[PDB]
Structure of GLUTAMINYL-TRNA synthetase:
Amino acid sequence: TNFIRQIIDEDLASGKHTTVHTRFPPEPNGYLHIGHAKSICLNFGIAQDYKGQCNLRFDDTNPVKEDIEYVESIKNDVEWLGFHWSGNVRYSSDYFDQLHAYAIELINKGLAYVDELTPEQIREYRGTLTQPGKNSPYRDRSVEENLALFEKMRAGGFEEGKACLRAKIDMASPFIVMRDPVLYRIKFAEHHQTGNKWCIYPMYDFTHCISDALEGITHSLCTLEFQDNRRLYDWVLDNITIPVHPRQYEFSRLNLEYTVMSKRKLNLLVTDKHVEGWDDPRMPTISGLRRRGYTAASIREFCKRIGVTKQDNTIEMASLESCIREDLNENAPRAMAVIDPVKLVIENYQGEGEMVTMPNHPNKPEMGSRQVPFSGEIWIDRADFREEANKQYKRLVLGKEVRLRNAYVIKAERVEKDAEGNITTIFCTYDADTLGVIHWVSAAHALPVEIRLYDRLFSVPNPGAADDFLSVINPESLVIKQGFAEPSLKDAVAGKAFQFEREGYFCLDSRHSTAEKPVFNRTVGLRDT
RNA sequence: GGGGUAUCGCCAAGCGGUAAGGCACCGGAUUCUGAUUCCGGCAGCGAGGUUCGAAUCCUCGUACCCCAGCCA
Ligand SMILES: NC(=O)CC[C@H](N)C(=O)NS(=O)(=O)OC[C@H]1O[C@@H](n2cnc3c(N)ncnc32)[C@H](O)[C@@H]1O
């Protein structure tokens, strides 16, 4: 329960409404991102929670910026997230002729007219945040003149920017939006759904209130920027022959630390190639978060955990993080992986290996146990090995012993180095019947695995407010290791995310992995203190 | 100008009845993952008025967001 829902129960009891009918109106000019998920939960959840209907509508009014590619993806992430829409997918373009008729109703009613101030001009007459606007000399043309001219615009008689249809509101209203907001505009650009049937497109403020109405929406839910815009949402509706009037309520938009979220800036990392793609695993996009290894639920949880308020906010990473972890900790079966590897030879080991039994999930044997190849020419993570270390360091010490994960207690007793003085091997001896702790991978039965260690894309908490967000990208947002994993990981089906013991939760990256060079993305690391 | 916001480090309840939970975080217990679990540990813009008493009320100021695209 949040204020929007609180309003919903009230609108219910009074009987202002019977069923709720919400909507998600993303424009198809980029992919969805976590923020949208917030928006996607609000509207889809309210509806199902109230046995209502939510639809997916692509507010495709600006042909020039939108592309078919997006609508396909927006459609997917929506499903993927876990929601289904009411009836078919509706496009604002579905209501184009509808908007046209309505523009005419305003014209005939005399509340809209063909203004001819060049764009530059239209702004000058607009006035400012403190100085009222000034009526255009065209403002008062006759209904007959307006109908004629509109039709011309529509018939392409005017070049782009040479004419526009405008409402006749109040040029000196404090709401800049009511200063004779433009209704239609000329754009000779093929629309992704109507092709070239249209030369004049309608504006969002115009399109949006009508679509909602014509759809039967009970609560147009949006983000705060559109609060001023509520004035014109009601005006248009309050001035055309349409039978319902969806009330609008806005809320705060999701802001995440260390990552921009504007479909534009995201769009910029993509175009200027600073990331693999909209879905590069470092992105805040859903497509990305998915490839990164986020479970629809963790996202839906995140969304649940941050509420919907009118307050400005900026969620920390640890929140989104805590979420995937809560999910994965409980579901992902553990495995063995070694990210940095130095060879460790147990000279006391005679033979060619054996077979150590490891659980799939230690706090839940319910997921059974697997069989992994133990040996004496194994691998380990360099950071487990130290010739010198304090009392808190629990891993391998030059004269100590560490219980190898699900196997034996070895005991380093020598070491060896090279040119630069870095070690190449740690000769040690294993105990006989013993079955701190560390993990490992038999070098022999080792699966060569590429590992992509990800980190927050941007170096600063609020790259948005930065001068050049690109200039503040973390060069270490991605760090490609080359490690070795037990042979089980051979059968990692791109999808499940295993938990490489003591390292993090990983998933096989489904944009690069091959039969021989599987690629495991680190969704999120573990809590290390 | 106008439209908004003002409770813990980050979110988020409470809507006059004497300040929820979440995440971060610091202690302690277990753990062949320094994880997991586990218990313990840390609060309402300012100033005034209003009440018996208000974070929720009235007023002043203060802050910070948004609005001068033929983008949405
Ligand atoms: N009346 C409205 O909702 C505005 C719709 C408009 N076409 C729009 O905002 N375009 S959009 O494609 O950028 O966004 C579509 C809808 O997604 C949600 N949304 C957009 N940006 C968001 C953000 N940063 N955080 C959370 N939710 C966000 C809104 O419901 C938005 O309308």
